[PDB]
């Protein structure tokens, strides 16, 4: 019956062949975080670790989480090291639920991950502010507005905006199919940069996702995830070309104590002209224990 215990989260990202502009062909992202048990009914403390080599960047972090329904909140401080150089970092985030159809979320970060993770090759520091609004119109219908402002340590400010939708097309005992149309807007300021800093980009990518169930017995299961998208990307001084994206993954859930998933992703969009392709693998695991 025990279901609120200590929790270990481990998630990772690695590039198979990422010929994109803000990532080398082969990069490695790994983050591991452990949550304490409910210290009391709403409070949890966590500590964690972050790793990124592509010149190696590591993170040591610790923070607290408060949790009731209708409102979730956490703060987090981290220390980031690079080439015998320490720099401080902190995160504040939360969401609350207005009416149980509407939810508003907020997020403050230093340093921000919304900065391409090594514009810091020249030591580019960034602090940001995120906000989002999510609205559930049916039980089969869901829209998400989001935006973020980011201040770089080289005078560049990035204002990103995203708008997502989630429409349920088909819901079977074994198969569900979602329509996930996505919109994205990004604007920057600094013009001659050593990192991919597009001045004004806008994308329209209609996409679907299909979750198929391979096997299930009662409270533990196994599913495969197929997702595909074809869209267009516009960039000022460069016009427009096509965006295509594919994903394949699988999920395992076991006794509400084991959750694991791994996804193989491919995408091909234009960066400053003609299209380059990104191929990478993502995974995540959550365990609950002593």
Curated annotation (Swiss-Prot):
Localization annotation: Cell outer membrane
Expression induction or repression: Levels of this protein are negatively controlled by the second messenger ppGpp (at protein level) at a post-transcriptional level. Increased levels of c-di-GMP lead to decreased levels of PgaA.
Gene knockout outcome: Deletion of pgaA does not prevent PGA synthesis but does block its export. The synthesized PGA is retained in the periplasm and accumulates at the cell poles. Disruption of the pga operon causes severe and persistent defects in the biofilm formation process.
Coiled-coil intervals, chain numbering: none
Transmembrane portions of the chain: none
UniProt domain comment: Contains a predicted C-terminal beta-barrel porin domain and a N-terminal periplasmic superhelical domain containing tetratricopeptide repeats, which may mediate protein-protein interactions, perhaps with PgaB.
Described function: Exports the biofilm adhesin polysaccharide poly-beta-1,6-N-acetyl-D-glucosamine (PGA) across the outer membrane. The PGA transported seems to be partially N-deacetylated since N-deacetylation of PGA by PgaB is needed for PGA export through the PgaA porin.
Listed name of the protein: Poly-beta-1,6-N-acetyl-D-glucosamine export protein
The organism of origin for this protein: Escherichia coli (strain K12)
Gene: pgaA
Full-protein positions shown: 513 to 807 of 807
